[PDB]
Amino acid sequence: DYDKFVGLSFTGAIGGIIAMAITGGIFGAKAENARKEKNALISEVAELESK
Amino acid sequence: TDKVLQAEQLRQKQLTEDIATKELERKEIEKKRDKIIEALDVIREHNLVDAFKDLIPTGENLSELDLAKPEIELLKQSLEITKKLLGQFSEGLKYIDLTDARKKLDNQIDTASTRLTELNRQLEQSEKLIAGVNAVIKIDQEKSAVV
Amino acid sequence: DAFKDLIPTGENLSELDLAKPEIELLKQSLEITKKLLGQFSEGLKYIDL
């Protein structure tokens, strides 16, 4: 889902001026945020494997 | 002790049935997201190149006459550019909506999983209860044997 | 098949020998970029899979 998220967010970016604006504002931040949260979840399940 | 036995057995039986019911519910929620993932996959047909592969066929033409439409031909150009842009927007909005629906059903799955965890903890508590009850009943039988 | 794409974009239908030295070449170059970018995105999907 996240790979598809960054794909669609970048398509919503590269269209035009306000497209860049709204999509890089919302999902440009949401990609980093959901990615860091997601990789924290990666680390948690990896620690459960490690536990 | 036997009344407590039967009451807790019926209790944990209802608990087990309810846990299986909630498992069926969350499996059905997991069946519901199939339409959402397939919809956003069949919308997912454009990625980083296909924007330019839309910018070029709107740059295409059929009829040319070298004069008298310097910008009149460009009217159709700019309007079809805005067509393809706004075609990307509304589908992007529907993409946003269905990802929010994904977050909603994932919240459903998470709350159901917490209910699963708590009811399974209560189920294991009742396992301890009914196990000790059955054990002391078996003791009572063995007590009568030693009698 | 790269060259077998470079040739049919080099093809034409209508010719008039004047007044489109490069106006005809606009469609040429744009369809060249079409076939190139058609190779790119499919190449990216190839990378992904």
Numbering used by the authors:
A (entry chain C): 259 to 309
B (entry chain M): 149 to 295
C (entry chain N): 198 to 246
Can you quote the paper on this entry?
We have unraveled structures of the soluble components and the pore assembly of the YaxAB cytolysin from Y. enterocolitica. The crystal structures show an atypical fold, comprising a head domain reminiscent of ClyA family toxins and pronounced coiled-coil and foot domains unique to the YaxAB system. In line with our finding that the isolated YaxA and YaxB head domains form spoked oligomers in solution, the YaxB head domain in isolation was sufficient for recruitment to membrane-bound YaxA. Together, our biochemical data support a role for YaxA as the initial membrane-interacting subunit of the toxin, able to bring the lytic effector YaxB to the target cell surface. Therefore, we propose that this class of toxins defines a new structural family of α-PFTs.
Along its largest dimensions, the C10 symmetric complex spans 160 Å perpendicular and 200 Å parallel to the membrane plane. The map accommodates one YaxA–YaxB dimer per radial spoke, in which the head domains form an extended interface, while the coiled-coil stalks remain distinctly apart. Notably, YaxA protomers are not in contact with each other in the pore, but interact instead with two adjacent YaxB subunits in cis and trans (see below). Embedded in the amphipol membrane surrogate, the foot domain helices of YaxA and YaxB protomers form a staggered, 40-meric α-helical annulus with a diameter of 31 Å at its narrowest distance. The largest contact area between pore protomers exists between the head domains of YaxA and YaxB within a spoke (cis), burying an average surface of 1476 Å2 via a close network of polar and hydrophobic residues. Across two spokes (trans), YaxA and YaxB interact through a hydrophobic patch at the juncture between head and stalk domains, burying a surface of 1088 Å2. The putative transmembrane segment of the C10 symmetric YaxAB complex consists of 40 staggered helices, jointly contributed from YaxA and YaxB foot domains. Notably, YaxA foot domain helices α4 and α5 cover only about half of this distance, requiring YaxB helices α4′ and α4″ to traverse the entire theoretical bilayer. Inside the membrane, two adjacent YaxB protomers form a hydrophobic seal via a conserved α4′ (V197, F200, I204) and α4″ (L227, L234) interface.
